[PDB]
Amino acid sequence: SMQQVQHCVAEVLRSSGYLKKLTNATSILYNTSLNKVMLKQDEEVARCHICAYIASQKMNEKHMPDLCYYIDSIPLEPKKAKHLMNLFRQSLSNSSPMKQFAWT
């Protein structure tokens, strides 16, 4: 759904250009997360948010260093949110579908 990914990318952060690139990422990363990363009924309510934050780091490292993002938008405990997002990065930010998504 476009509204959930749009709201999640929005409140992780702070049209159809770079925020559109970010939305497209969160969606692909979330869809492959649904298949290869399994969460219980609590952690599942932040599957979009965590995925959104991952895409944010990619922007901060690839094209725009000036982009800002903060962690506590994730509706879990910040230690638990940290552990889950490290798990998500290390697992499927190097996945073969998520390698030719042009970030420019």
Partner: protein, 138 residues
């Protein structure tokens, strides 16, 4: 007595209720559907619809129906047949879908994998009603 001396006087009426709750797995389809994610719920809905229209259906025909529904509706991204089968076994692990192995009754009768459902329709449709992105599959 087993539960009374595993959890530690005249024993109470509550231990009888504890016996009748411990050895009756009163699992609800409410609790089973609520432990799934959106993709397992979607594949459960497509399985239900394929068995509604065919009722002697294989894994592969249900995957064909899932592909047709997911290209008609365009929700997330379509899955490959083995990922579909893995989510079907996940639904076995949850206890909503069973995959058996049975003979066909056509002109070419061989053994195939078959989907049966052991869940009741009313609370299934009630749980799937509350999700807006699933009602094209109901």
């Amino acid at each position: 007595i087993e539960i009374y001396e595993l959890e530690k006087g005249k024993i109470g009426l509550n231990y009888i209720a504890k016996v009748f709750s411990k050895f009756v797995n009163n699992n609800s389809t409410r609790t089973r559907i609520a432990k799934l994610n959106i993709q397992q719920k979607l594949i459960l809905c497509t399985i239900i619809q394929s068995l509604k229209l065919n009722s002697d259906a294989t894994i592969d025909e249900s995957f064909d129906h899932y592909i047709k529904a997911i290209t008609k509706t365009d929700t997330l991204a379509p899955l490959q047949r083995n990922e579909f089968l893995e989510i079907c076994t996940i639904l076995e692990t949850c206890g909503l879908v069973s995959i058996k192995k049975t003979k066909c009754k056509g002109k070419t009768k061989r053994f195939v994998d078959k989907i049966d459902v052991d869940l009741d329709m009313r609370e299934f449709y009630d749980e799937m009603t509350k999700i807006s992105i699933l009602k094209p599959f109901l």
